[PDB]
Ligand SMILES: CCCCCCCCCCCCCCCCCC(=O)O[C@H](COC(=O)CCCCCCCCCCCCCCC)COP(=O)(O)OCCN
């Protein structure tokens with residue numbers, strides 16, 4: 014009941030089959046990891062003897078999608094040794110701050126991935142397609158969705174102890190806070206894209222005429238941003254939140 | 264949350280305060296029913312000595328929103344005799360098959376409502392504006408949103424034991440099959456409007472050139488309709504179920 018988490022789709026421009034891991038699709042608790050390590054073992058077996066590439070859609074991956082240390086460990090010890098080696102490339106799409114922080118929390122186990130040239134962090138579906146068969150990227154429909162009909166606010170500033178220059182992209186279904194400055198994730202300076210589904214925007218608050226707060230469900234401390242067009246960001250987010258509430262279950 | 268189930272809002276053209284019962288908001292059971300009924304009491308007591316009106320929002324009212332028999336019967340006794348007589352009108356909006364059936368099954372308890380000139384079914388969402396001014400109307404925003412941007416397919420035919428002419432209206436978040444011909448609900452000829460949120464539309468089938476089926480969640484029997492433009496109705500519905508799925512929870 015988890016053939017959607019890890020599916021095969023496409024071939025790379027280097028001539029290797031592509032396998033997608035939708036991190037958000039997997040849930041720690043419920044979809045027993047025993048079940049996913051199973052399915053990944055099974056769709057890879059026929060392939061991991063020869064070289065293959067992986068695309069991990071870290072899109073909106075959060076703590077509920079995590080690999081607990083015991084599980085995460087089992088992943089670096091449960092495959093034929095060549096199997097790890099034949100992974101020609103692992104495109105990491107939509108890495109966000111939680112996965113990064115997860116990546117730091119589990120640096121003990123992800124030590125091998127640090128600096129690994131094989132991990133290519135990708136910014137958009139278009140940059141991932143370049144490494145694929147005539148740009149036929151099969152990122153989930155859901156993922157690709159987040160890329161269209163976006164109201165983008167550049168030069169925004171996420172306020173925190175460390176201020177992060179970000180662009181706040183408001184899409185009909187989610188707000189994405191794409192960092193404009195790179196930060197390290199597994200030793201590679203990459204852009205982070207934090208996605209906040211309208212369903213998760215509990216409160217939007219305009220602090221100043223150029224600063225707003227975004228309370229995201231279950232993330233406690235609201236996010237804070239500074240931007241010249243704040244009134245407009247807030248209004249766009251409220252709209253998206255409202256259009257969402259209208260279609261809420263009874 | 265019982266608090267959004269029944270609330271006071273507006274005054275009718277006849278100068279009577281209106282109360283809205285949003286059926287879908289109630290969930291059958293134990294305590295919800297007495298929260299709900301203790302709530303309607305605390306809300307109505309101030310007004311039920313003078314003529315007041317009720318708009319019953321039956322949109323999407325299904326089994327999970329029903330008043331079990333013992334709970335329903337409390338509604339006809341727990342209020343003062345004058346409270347019942349003071350209801351000058353009960354606008355019934357979006358009555359649907361299930362409710363029709365529910366009232367058929369409780370045809371006994373509902374004898375007092377059967378034939379009642381005080382019950383006004385709103386078969387034309389605009390007809391409500393004939394007893395209550397739009398600015399005084401306060402149907403849930405969600406109920407109202409189901410009326411906007413509807414791709415309407417008139418002259419459809421719903422096959423079943425009895426084939427009823429219907430209009431299939433696909434909106435961004437739902438499919439509504441509105442009977443084109445009236446049926447009796449509590450002795451009144453009215454237009455039912457069954458609503459199927461994209462969230463409930465499991466299987467979508469193009470049975471042939473001018474026919475299609477919808478399999479609805481928790482509804483073993485499939486909705487089978489006929490229409491010239493079926494591939495268009497199937498595509499329309501497939502688009503919204505898909506638009507939905509591509510925006511649901513990881
Ligand atoms: C063996 C699987 C690796 C699982 C990694 C889980 C943690 C990911 C954290 C998010 C950022 C990194 C995503 C991409 C990780 C790619 C790791 C990789 O390349 O593993 C190679 C093998 O690649 C594969 O096995 C193919 C891919 C298998 C599925 C991977 C699914 C990753 C799911 C991540 C979920 C998000 C994080 C969850 C958070 C709480 C082998 O590495 P090695 O040679 O250093 O190993 C030495 C010991 N054997």
Ligand SMILES: CCCCCCCCCCCCCCCCCC(=O)O[C@H](COC(=O)CCCCCCCCCCCCCCC)COP(=O)(O)OCCN
Nearest residue numbers: 284286317319328329330338339340347350353365375376
């Ligand atoms: C007393 C409350 C009536 C509850 C009716 C529940 C069943 C409704 C079934 C759906 C179609 C009808 C909806 C409108 C019903 C209006 C009933 C009404 O007018 O009651 C009058 C009183 O009106 C009011 O009390 C004000 C409104 C109170 C809230 C009503 C909420 C209705 C909720 C229906 C939920 C949908 C059905 C659930 C299904 C399984 C008094 O009638 P009477 O003089 O014959 O009574 C004699 C004995 N006392």
